[PDB]
Amino acid sequence: QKYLGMLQNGYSDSTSAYVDNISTGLVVNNESKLEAYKITRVKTDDYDKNINYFDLMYEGNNQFFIRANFKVSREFGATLRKNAGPSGIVGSLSGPLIANTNFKSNYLSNISDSEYKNGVKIYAYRYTSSTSATNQGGGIFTFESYP
């Protein structure tokens, strides 16, 4: 147990595939691999993800931002382009809203499998109000789906 975190041999499927040495598996619909999968991402003033909900993942029809933890941000957020670059709301964080599995963070298809396998997409703005943008970290992302 002191090597790998937790592999889902009939355990909970809350993603949790996180800092490198946590062997964790998941299988969902819309890309061709059963995933013993890993995430090794670092962003600013951060250790692994911070503020709950920050990765790239794999449920929906496209390649998109994680549903990392069980609380859902209905927040209509502005996920803009690559590291520390503001270019406008390409990602309009909104529905769908469901949870309990690896799910979609408002279909950020624009951030794709190339930015998933050794990605850069923990960067994100948070909005308290309808236009109050705050930057709390952003940097390297990493993922690897495997047998």
Q: What are phi and psi of 133, to 5 degrees?
A: -90, 135
**Residues 108, 57: Cα–Cα separation, whole Å:** 10
Number of residues assigned to the chain: 147
Resolution of this entry, Å = 3.9
**Residues 135, 60: Cα–Cα separation, whole Å:** 26
If one counts every other C-beta atom within 10 angstroms of the C-beta of residue 134, the result is 8
Q: What are phi and psi of 120, to 5 degrees?
A: -135, 25
Burial 62-71 (b: 16+ CB within 10 A, else e): bbbbbbbbee
Q: What is the CA 61 to chain-centroid distance, rounded?
A: 15
Q: What is the CA 139 to chain-centroid distance, rounded?
A: 13
**Residues 27, 59: Cα–Cα separation, whole Å:** 9
99, 70 Cβ separation under 8 angstroms? yes
**Residues 123, 56: Cα–Cα separation, whole Å:** 11
Q: What is the CA 84 to chain-centroid distance, rounded?
A: 17
Task: Tell me how the structure was determined.
Answer: cryo-EM
